[model samples]
Target chain A: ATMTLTDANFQQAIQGDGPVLVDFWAAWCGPCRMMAPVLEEFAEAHADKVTVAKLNVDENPETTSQFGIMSIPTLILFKGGRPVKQLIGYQPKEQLEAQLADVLQ
Target chain B: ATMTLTDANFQQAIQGDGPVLVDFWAAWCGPCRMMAPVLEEFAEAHADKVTVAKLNVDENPETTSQFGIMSIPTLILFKGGRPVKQLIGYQPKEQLEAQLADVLQ
Candidate 1:
């Protein structure tokens, strides 16, 4: 299961070892709902190697606005508490896997 | 004089020829206040080589967050609509001049 995050815990969560993938989503976004299961699977599969977390844009406006999230379901890969890659909108499992290949390696 | 900017015009503003130095500042920040005159002088000096613009972090949270700016008086030099150099806090005229020497070249 993925870790649900908040603005208060966000900086600390992304600071640890390995790369962290943060899914920035909103409750009303259909694409975000669709990507929920996909993120769950990804989180579970790479639980030890990578950290997958979810942050609700509506609930965590501070973090959401800080990252300039104009669109829902934006995914940002963080390393050492700094953003390295940003993907906007929903992406399939295979595509996400491909994107994470180098980071995971 | 530096151009006052908003989120709506930010993208287009940075998408021009030559380098654009954007000062992300707030009214309450002392360092931001200190840098105002320096920025004015720099803007006047490099008016031909660079474009200097100011964006209020308080008013334009979207742009501020997009760049992941945590500190006030943050300066981002954008070239070709992409951020190339970032400077935090207040910098003296000489230091800023040295930093921009290569960019202006």
Candidate 2:
């Protein structure tokens, strides 16, 4: 299940031992729209392990600016309450899995 | 045809009599990859009046940071050597044309 992360609830949601994959995206971003379905599928596939979340870059500028995010559809994987890997733009599930192979494992 | 714009030649390429549509994108960006085809179609269709160009955001940090580009697939339509309008993310040809209807006319 994917959670909607926001400026207020972001810091707290990302903490703890499990890994949280936050999709920093926006409504106007075309690639983000494409990734939405893929992200959903990914969240379903890894429901038992990873936590999938979303944060709208437009509505939540605080966290966006804080990370100095210069791109949309950016995927940030957090582990142990800290950022581990960052991916910009849309990516297939296989590619994403390969990219986060070590971290996810 | 879409012209490749870089940091060194960016200033000169943008200044001209007609309008120039510069797409700020990257290699790793999935949205940019998706937009490549649409942008190509748009460029071919408007070959008579508008100049279509692409700039690599990762390679050209100077121009990217100068414009405060916080997203890829950023379409900056320039007229008379000035940045007239900016559209972030991917957009269809119809939507793009509509968005730039007045400026283009």
Candidate 3:
């Protein structure tokens, strides 16, 4: 299951043992909708190694505002509670996996 | 042919007869490379209706700095010489076309 990230627990969530990949998305965004399934499978594949999470901008404005996410479907990789990588837009599954492979280790 | 944009001619290129779609890219960007062929086809397809141009950020620092472009493969749509829409990262052709369709008219 995907971790639901919110302002209150966002920092604590990424402070765990491994890297956390959070998908910053909104309901109305077309690209975000398209990438939903891709992320679902990603979360399942790397469930043990990486923490896959999703933060809905509409539901959680506090977290969204803090990240300064001007665009939808912005994926941020956090390792040891610090943001290491930021990818904007809907990325291909293979590309997303390749990027995670570098940071997971 | 895609209009090669430079700092000197940036304003002139966009101040054309129609809406201009400028692709701000860099040579070493992998996503930019993936988007090249899509943009090429887009440039040819929309030749008569829109001015598709490419601006290399590394070579033209002045324009890049002016636009405050912090990321590669940032696509900006200009209408009447004013930037109306900005999209960061590599977007699919159909999505790109749909965005352009809204502004081109």
Which pairs of residues collide in model 3? none
Q: What is the C-alpha RMSD of each candidate to the true structure, in Å?
A: 6.5, 15.6, 15.2
Error of 2 at A49 (Å): 1.9
Which number leads on DockQ? 1
Off by over 4 Å in 1: B1-105
Instruction: Label model 2 with its docking quality class.
Output: incorrect
Select the stronger candidate by TM-score from 1 and 3.
1
| Candidate 3 Cα errors over 4 Å, as ranges | A1-105
**Native-referenced Cα lDDT, model 2:** 0.81
TM-scores vs. true structure, each candidate: 0.55, 0.54, 0.51
- Tens digit of per-residue lDDT, candidate 1, span A1-105: 888899999888888568888898888999999999999998888887778889998899888765555567878877766666666549898888887888766
* Model 3: lDDT of residue B41: 89
Ranking by DockQ: 1, 2, 3
Which candidate wins on TM-score? 1
Per-residue lDDT over B40-65 for candidate 1, one digit per residue giving the tens place of the 0 to 100 score = 99999888888899999889988977
Candidate 3 global CA lDDT score? 0.78
Regions of candidate 2 where Cα sits further than 4 Å from its true position = B1-105
